[PDB]
Design a protein around this ligand. Structure first.
Ligand SMILES: [Mg+2]
Ligand SMILES: [Mg+2]
Ligand SMILES: [Mg+2]
Ligand SMILES: [Mg+2]
Ligand SMILES: [Mg+2]
Ligand SMILES: [Mg+2]
Ligand SMILES: [Mg+2]
Ligand SMILES: [Mg+2]
Ligand SMILES: [Mg+2]
Ligand SMILES: [Mg+2]
Ligand SMILES: [Mg+2]
Ligand SMILES: [Mg+2]
Ligand SMILES: [Mg+2]
Ligand SMILES: [Mg+2]
Lengths: 127, 155, 92, 197, 106, 61
RNA sequence: GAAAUUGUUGAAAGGGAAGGGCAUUUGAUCAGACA
RNA sequence: GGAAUACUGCCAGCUGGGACUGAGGACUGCGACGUAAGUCAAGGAUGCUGGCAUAAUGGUUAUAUGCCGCCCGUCUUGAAA
RNA sequence: AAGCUCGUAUCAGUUUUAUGAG
RNA sequence: GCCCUGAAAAUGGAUGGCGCUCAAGCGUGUUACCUAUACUCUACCGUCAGGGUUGAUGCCCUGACGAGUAGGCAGGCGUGGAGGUCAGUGACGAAGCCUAGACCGUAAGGUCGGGUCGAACGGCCUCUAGUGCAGAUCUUGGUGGUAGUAGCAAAUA
RNA sequence: UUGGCGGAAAGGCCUUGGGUGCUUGCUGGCGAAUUGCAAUGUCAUUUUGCGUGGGGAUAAAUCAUUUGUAUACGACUUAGA
């Protein structure tokens, strides 16, 4: 029950991992560009890891879209939730990570009354 | 506020589609699919069995009969791309198949199916009995043997 | 195959034995019930909150060697939150 | 088309037979080769003996038990030619090589099985007449194989038994053909002849 | 009868490849009894199934199927190119596949 | 590949927008942009081009 | 109460290194859509 | 003496099988078939039907298989060397 | 990288023509 | 023209290997076939350019392009503190940390669930700087393999 | 069930007799359907699991002690109801 959209195509689903991050613990997986003049990764030899570039950019008609077809909007309270009262078919609300369970109950009740989709309705509310 | 509201929102009015220029025209069957032709079933529950093609239906399907008395295949629909048309042909002018169609075969035993099966199979057997060994041929099943090349076989 | 015996299969026999052993071990684990149930089953937690502490709390309420333990601090917090939820259920 | 293809190695050229067998094994066909001592290599006996002595020269200097292993049997020579054409250090190569059996003579149960030939590797079809060729059994005996006489005696005994079997089979076949010929004038025979059978 | 087979046998040879790089999206199939591209033109568009067995029963069966189809001929010796919904696992180089007679043009 | 005879991704420039943050100056720029687009007046073109100049390029009169 | 490093338990691989990329099989595990 | 055939080239001749793609989203345009209202393959796919409705497809993860893949930084033409 | 102008304006690792060198 | 001799050392090895003799060798001719990040068509990303338009440094249409060290221009991600604002989050659990779970970005990163934890902390518009590490035989601290290893054998017991 | 042969890795080949089923060599009579227009649509030997039961048989090795034809330690070679 979202806005009709074309099929969502991801050009590169795999994560871009930094070179030698699998080799050394001190090298994190956060992507860094290799600046070495003799780097085979920088020179793009066959068999090495892929590198991020603008060709992998996603379609503008499906960018920032969840698999259900909505754009995620963070909400912390009822006033934040009610900003999406008219944009129901395009935006889905996600409760912020630091919202307590007592306020999450109120947010879920208000979203159910307004017909607004909630991405994470089970959080902190186990029965 | 956990997230700032965006300035611009898309309109939620779903647009209509453009006027499609794709007209529905009737299917042109293969030239070897003539009513009364013996067909070999390639797939399904009755795979490998030989039936008789009777009528071309509106939903691009072929009406076929075993006949039910010979090999146990009732009045069914088959897909034209899942059969092999042989050179063997029987006369079908004595069979009245004007009743059967998509609404007849819609599933949403009635015994109307049984009565129609008997009525068709009487004329079918009457025509089949003129050719020797044809009834035994229809009761037998088809299968590929060792060394059989379908690209070289004649049907 | 080994150079000392070329007419006897070695790698294929090893693979066959390995496949058989893996299948037997997986079937034994399934019989012991150490694997998750089906998604549509009654005892499935699919789409729900997965918590070792909550599972242990409810199992102790219902009443081998394991590394899953529930602390008294977490147990008291679960009791307090359950009282809050019950009060809300009664008030609604 | 058979689950197991048994190849009579007599009269075949070793390299072409190895090529076709390696391709069949990689495609996934189970092959058993018999009578490897009757294989042929084109060229003169002293040429092929010289080549095998060059192979014998090849050996690891600091430890001879680590070097190339020089197997003297004719079936082992054929296996070396086949392993040179199969990428044997991979799992696929090992799986292909484990679909092959090579034997000297025709041991059981293959002594009662049908045996085929490969025309593209046969000496009488490939080599030009007048060209010299070598026999693998004689080459193996010259380079160190020690079981040529036992194989010959066992093959002679097998040939005696096979000749007796073939005499019985030929008598039965003549009887069957005589029984089939007397029904050639029947209407069923006429209809089958009209249909091509 | 003694036989119920309504398919032709084939062998999965390899992927489409050059000397030093393969393309798993396309598989090469050798169909039994086919020796020329002209003969292989009969089987273009036919469905192919790779049928294998697994120990764990799924949906009431231990038999699993990977579906694909013939696309074009390959070489001069009757080998054909095939594409599957999921690529063949490359452990099946030398394994058997079934080419069915549908969709039919006879 | 192709053998390029001209430089690729070459900017024309021509001082498309003013560098000032003055709201009233931007309103005048909008008005004369509309006038230059909808009148085909060389006077409007000249005034719009002059509205983009810098202080050192706009001496007092 | 992090990491390096270590113990126990469970799963897995291992015929003279391991690690990585593309693709799929197998085992385990999991989200969304459920009118 | 009269034909035929090969070869080469042309057709705004006809027709069968196979694969990949389906972007766009009221209408507007250029056309075609028609006395006509209308229709159309003409400014980008529609119509009919089935099974499933969940780990089935798919993602993650451990591994296996085919092929590819030298250890980074620095400095020196140049570095596995 | 900035300005002023011009914009059938300014031209060109080329050929042709005429005329030299060989 | 082809073939043989037309000089060769020293661990065991090389038309890349197997091997090949009316070749799988040499010379030539006719076809078919294999596959590059090349060419052709299509989709998508970005850049540039040309038009249209009374969230207008936005929207719509069209076309062509995309290698790169030193270096240049631009748009962004993240950190400590400061002004404003969300009458923002929080003992029905802030920050931190762990995570076989989930999503969004080409990426820098951002977001959600579960566990642990116990008191503070964030989004946006701006201001400010002791603001981002794999290297420097870098500094300080901590920890491995070596390894239950070398060794604990001068001075009579 | 009778007999013969087969040792290269025989483990298979031939054969006597009765019993018990089928036979499409030929002629008939019943049943098939709804797996819904396809979805391998599951079909072939062995079973380190059990229950039923009639029969068949009731060991050894190692540590420790001991010898020195042996020995760095393991190992080897001896002996002990
Ligand atoms: Mg503490
Ligand atoms: Mg640790
Ligand atoms: Mg999958
Ligand atoms: Mg490599
Ligand atoms: Mg070659
Ligand atoms: Mg040649
Ligand atoms: Mg380009
Ligand atoms: Mg917290
Ligand atoms: Mg600093
Ligand atoms: Mg550091
Ligand atoms: Mg650095
Ligand atoms: Mg240091
Ligand atoms: Mg010591
Ligand atoms: Mg002392």
């Amino acid at each position: 029950a979202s806005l009709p959209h074309p099929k969502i195509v991801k050009k590169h689903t795999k994560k871009f991992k930094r070179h030698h991050s699998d080799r050394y613990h001190r090298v994190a997986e956060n992507w860094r560009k290799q600046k070495g003049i003799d780097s085979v990764v920088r020179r793009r030899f066959r068999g090495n890891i892929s590198q991020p570039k603008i060709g992998y950019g996603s379609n503008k008609k499906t960018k920032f879209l969840s698999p259900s077809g909505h754009k995620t909007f963070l909400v912390a309270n009822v006033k934040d939730l009610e900003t999406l009262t008219m944009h129901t078919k395009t935006y889905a609300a996600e409760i912020a990570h630091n919202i307590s369970a007592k306020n999450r109950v109120v947010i879920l009740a208000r979203a159910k009354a307004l017909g607004i989709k909630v991405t994470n309705p089970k959080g902190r509310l186990a029965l | 506020s956990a997230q700032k509201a965006p300035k611009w929102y898309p309109s939620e009015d779903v647009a209509a589609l453009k006027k499609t220029r794709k007209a529905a025209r009737p299917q042109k069957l293969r030239a070897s699919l003539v009513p009364g032709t013996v067909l070999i079933l390639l797939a399904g529950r009755f795979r490998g069995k030989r039936v008789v093609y009777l009528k071309h239906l509106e939903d691009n399907t072929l009406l076929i009969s075993g006949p039910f008395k010979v090999n146990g295949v009732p009045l069914r629909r088959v897909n034209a791309r899942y059969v092999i048309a042989t050179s063997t042909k029987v006369s079908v002018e004595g069979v009245n198949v004007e009743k059967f169609n998509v609404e007849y075969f819609a599933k949403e035993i009635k015994a109307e199916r049984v009565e129609d099966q008997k009525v068709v199979d009487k004329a079918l057997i009457a025509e089949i009995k003129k050719t020797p060994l044809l009834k035994q041929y229809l009761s037998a099943s088809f299968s590929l043997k060792n060394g059989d090349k379908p690209h070289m076989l004649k049907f | 195959p080994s150079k000392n015996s070329i007419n006897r299969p070695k790698l294929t026999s090893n693979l066959h034995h390995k496949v058989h052993s893996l299948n037997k071990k997986r079937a034994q684990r399934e019989r012991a019930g150490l694997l998750k149930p089906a998604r549509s089953s009654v005892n499935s937690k699919s789409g729900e909150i997965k918590s070792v502490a909550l599972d242990l709390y409810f199992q102790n309420k219902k009443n081998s060697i394991t590394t899953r333990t529930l602390s008294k601090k977490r147990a008291k917090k679960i009791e307090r939150n359950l009282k809050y939820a019950t009060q809300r259920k009664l008030l609604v | 088309v058979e689950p197991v293809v048994v190849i009579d190695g007599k009269g075949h050229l070793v390299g072409r037979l190895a090529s076709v067998v390696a391709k069949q094994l990689l495609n996934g066909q189970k092959i058993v080769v018999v009578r490897a001592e009757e294989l042929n290599i084109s060229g003169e006996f002293f040429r092929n003996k010289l080549k095998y002595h060059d192979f014998l020269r090849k050996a690891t200097a600091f430890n001879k038990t680590r070097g190339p292993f020089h197997f003297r049997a004719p079936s082992r020579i054929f296996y070396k030619a086949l392993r040179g054409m199969v990428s044997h250090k991979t799992a696929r190569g090992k799986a292909a090589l484990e679909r092959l059996k090579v034997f000297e003579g025709i041991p059981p149960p293959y002594d009662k099985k049908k045996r085929v030939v490969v025309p593209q590797a046969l000496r009488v079809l490939r080599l030009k007449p007048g060209r010299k060729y070598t026999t693998l059994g004689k080459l193996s005996t010259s380079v160190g194989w020690k079981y040529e006489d036992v194989v010959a005696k066992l093959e002679a005994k097998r040939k005696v038994s096979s000749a007796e079997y073939y005499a019985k089979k030929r008598a039965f076949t003549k009887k069957v053909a005589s029984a089939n010929a007397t029904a050639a004038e029947s209407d069923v025979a006429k209809q089958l002849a009209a249909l091509g059978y | 009868a003694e036989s119920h087979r309504l398919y032709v046998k084939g062998k999965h040879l390899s992927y489409q490849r050059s000397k030093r790089v393969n393309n798993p999206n396309v598989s090469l199939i050798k169909i039994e009894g086919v020796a020329t591209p002209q003969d292989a033109q009969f089987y273009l568009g036919k469905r192919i199934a790779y049928v294998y067995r697994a120990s764990k029963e799924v949906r009431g069966s231990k038999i699993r199927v990977m579906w694909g189809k013939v696309t074009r001929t390959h070489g001069n010796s009757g080998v054909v190119r095939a594409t599957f919904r999921n690529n063949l696992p490359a452990k099946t180089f030398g394994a058997s596949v079934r080419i069915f007679l549908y969709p039919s043009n006879i | 590949g192709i053998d390029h005879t001209s430089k690729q991704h070459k900017r024309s420039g021509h001082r498309t927008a003013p560098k000032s943050d003055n709201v009233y100056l931007k309103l005048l720029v909008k008005l004369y942009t509309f006038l230059a687009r909808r009148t085909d007046a060389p006077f409007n073109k000249v005034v719009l081009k002059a509205l983009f100049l810098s202080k050192i390029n706009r001496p007092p009169v």
